[PDB]
Design a protein around this nucleic acid. Structure first.
Length: 226
RNA sequence: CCUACCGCAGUAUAUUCCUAAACACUAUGAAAUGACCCUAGUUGGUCCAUGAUCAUUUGGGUAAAACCAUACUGCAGACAUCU
């Protein structure tokens, strides 16, 4: 219970709080370019290089839709995004910082370019840090995909997120609730908890969410403890 | 006695119509709060009546010359007096 909360008369149920209104040039009410250049840089593994070398022009055109300048440096092994004078959206650089990172973690460009949309969010979760043994790490990482990918499919339908497992990372793209659930499932899966328990928990949560009378009270007696 | 090659000088190496593009000009309107470019100025840079930069199309112009190769045509086979 939070005490010392003041009343909020302006808050009513009519406002859709989660809608994202479009940002345009007229929305930037200062009317001036960004004061100084903002840049984000990442490194990528060496096996991605040639793929990046093929797709970079396409990547450039995508950022040309948002006035973001991109630089690939194969000698350094780095990808850089930066704002220009033509840039008017303050957030669109951060999404650019996501995109190259998604490109660094084996997410394909047609999937990764959707991070430029407003409703899309991404998470890159490190899985190589939990356990030091190689065989245990391989087994727990394969538990995420499962046999014939079905467990992975069971994740992607439940959290509504595109999930790609590569190396020491898992890259998830979707809504924020789905990202939260994916992070929980992945971090528990690296801690020797099988994903099927979380899958069953999400099923029970999904069926309880349909019933309106069950919203106020606790779901703990329905949920099997694991 | 005649042909062919050889010397020199010319002609041709696609033609007509429509059309696309380039370059430059020209016709009309727009000029000093002139116009354009650059993460952009403690005083930026470039072009600008010697016509910039924009719009309509106003209309015409240029895209050669020299040589090689092939064919054709023509002129000569000339040691050069002149006083």
């Amino acid at each position: 219970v939070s005490t010392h909360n003041r009343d909020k008369p302006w808050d009513t149920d009519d406002i859709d709080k989660w809608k994202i209104e479009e940002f345009k040039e007229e929305d930037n009410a200062s009317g001036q370019p960004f004061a100084e250049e903002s840049s984000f840089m990442t490194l990528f593994p060496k096996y991605r290089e040639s793929y990046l070398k093929t797709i970079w022009n396409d990547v450039t055109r995508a950022l040309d839709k948002h006035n973001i300048a991109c630089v690939l440096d194969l000698v350094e092994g780095s990808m850089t995004v930066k704002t220009t004078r033509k840039t008017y959206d303050p957030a669109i650089i951060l999404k650019a910082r996501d995109l190259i990172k998604l490109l660094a973690r084996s997410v394909p460009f047609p999937q990764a370019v959707k991070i430029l949309q407003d409703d899309m969010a991404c998470d890159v979760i490190k899985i190589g840090n939990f356990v030091t043994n190689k065989e245990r790490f391989v087994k727990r990482r394969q538990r995420l995909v499962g046999p014939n990918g079905n467990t992975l499919k069971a994740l992607e339908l439940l959290t509504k997120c595109y999930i790609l497992v590569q190396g020491n990372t898992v890259s998830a793209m979707g809504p924020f609730k789905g990202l939260k659930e994916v992070r929980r499932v992945v971090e528990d899966c690296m801690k020797n908890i099988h994903p099927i328990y979380h899958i069953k928990e999400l099923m029970i949560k999904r069926e309880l969410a349909k019933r309106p009378e069950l919203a106020n009270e606790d779901w703990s007696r329905f949920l099997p403890m694991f």
